[PDB]
Structures are given as C-alpha cells and as structure tokens.
Amino acid sequence: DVRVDKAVNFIKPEVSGVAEIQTVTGLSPSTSYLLTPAFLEQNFQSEAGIYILSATPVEGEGTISINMDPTVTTVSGFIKVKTDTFGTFDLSVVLTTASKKQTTGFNIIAAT
Amino acid sequence: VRVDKAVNFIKPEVSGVAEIQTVTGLSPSTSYLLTPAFLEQNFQSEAGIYILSATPVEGEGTISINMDPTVTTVSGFIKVKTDTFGTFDLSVVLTTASKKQTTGFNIIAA
C-alpha cells in the first residue's frame, strides 16, 4: 500500500535564482519517500513577473517544477528521497524571481 | 515509492457532464495513488477557464485543476485499487469542455 503522510509547503527563497535549503522533519528514520507538487487557490499574477520554482533533493533523485508562465504552464516531476536516522531530509529550492511570494507545496508519500 | 506510469486525463465532450476514463496495464488488485501533473500548456489559447475534477469510481479523493488566473489550484490526490485485470475507472468532468488542453496524473505505487 501507499499513502500521503503529510503535506508541506515549499519555502519562499529570499534571492532570485539562489537556492536555499528546506529541511523536512518529523518522518520515520531511514525511510524512502516520494514528493509530488500541489498548490491551492493562488493568485500568481498579484504582482509582476512569473512564479517559477524548482526543487531537488540534496541527496536523492528527481526534480519538481512549477512554472506559472501564462502561455507555457507546467506542474511536473517528483522527488525520491530518503530520511536520515533522525527522520529528516533536505531539499534545494530555487525561485527564479523571489518577489513571487505565492504558496506552493508537496505531498509526502510513503509505503504502508 | 515511485511513479509507475503517467497518464493524461480524457477530454470530455460536454461541459459539466462526467465521462469515464479507464486506466489499464497496471498490477492486478493493487493500491495506487494519483496526483496531478501537466507540461507546457497554454490554458489561454481560447476563451474560458480550464477547470477539471476527477474522482475514482471506487476509492476516495478528488483531483482538482482550476487554471483561473485569480485563484489557481492544482491539487488533490486519488486513492484507487485496480481490479483483477489491472484496471480502474475514473469519473472526469470539465466545467467548460471547449478547453482542450492536456493535463494528467502520476500513478504511484510502493
């Protein structure tokens, strides 16, 4: 079986094009998870520029892309990542234009 | 835990009238999770808003995709189990059927 363990929002990086580390905690130690993108009720045109997020695991596989360009829109990808012995993992998250302060996120999917 | 397959949603014919999508080629009698995805779509190639909802015929959850620029949502997940023939059915509805963009879902298993 498979299930959604919990939903987490992506961080909002401070600087355009410069990745920040997002740490996720509270999961089972030494366990494989799959992350998929999602967002709810966002106005991506509240100010100028385009919301474009990319996220990868520091150690793992996959890239999540959320590109809200109005004639070429993408929500795709996944991340495969394993927790450490403390139930945590790190992602690298980059916003192409950091003034886009909309909220997006991912589901954390687990075997059961 | 991985994506086994990605499949496109059907494009229903009539606004607000659900149609059945059958997914095949999966493991028999196995639980899957579905989450939405799409690539390089122009949701403004014509007038009206792309708004899709999908639910399993047997299972739970709803995927919602509302590309309204004022209130954009790409969300929800479906839990569904295949029959003994590796298939399952979804019920898919477009609010405005003239929006013929392509969207879809991941099929996830462990």
Numbering used by the authors:
A (entry chain B): 7 to 118
B (entry chain A): 8 to 117
Q: Which sentences did the original study use to describe this structure?
A:
All structures of the PvNVPd were refined to resolutions 1.17–1.22 Å. The structures of PvNVPd from two crystal forms are similar with a root mean square deviation (RMSD) < 0.3 Å; and residues 250–368 were resolved in both structures. First, the crystal packing of PvNVPd (P212121) reflects the intermolecular organization of the two P-domain dimers with a bending angle of ~110°, suggesting that the existence of this putative conformation in the T = 3 PvNV virions arises from the simultaneous rotation of A/B dimer and the translation of C/C dimer. In the interface of this parallel model, the three turns β1/β2, β6/β7, and β7/β8 from one PvNVPd monomer are in close proximity to those of one symmetry molecule in the absence of metal ions.
A major factor that limits the expansion of shrimp cultures is, however, infectious diseases from viruses, such as P. vannamei nodavirus (PvNV) and M. rosenbergii nodavirus (MrNV), which have inflicted heavy economic losses. In this work, we have determined the cryo-EM structures of T = 3 and T = 1 PvNV-LPs at atomic resolution, the crystal structures of the P-domains of PvNV and MrNV (PvNVPd and MrNVPd), and the crystal structure of the S-domain of PvNV (ΔN-ARM-PvNVSd) in the T = 1 subviral particle (SVP).
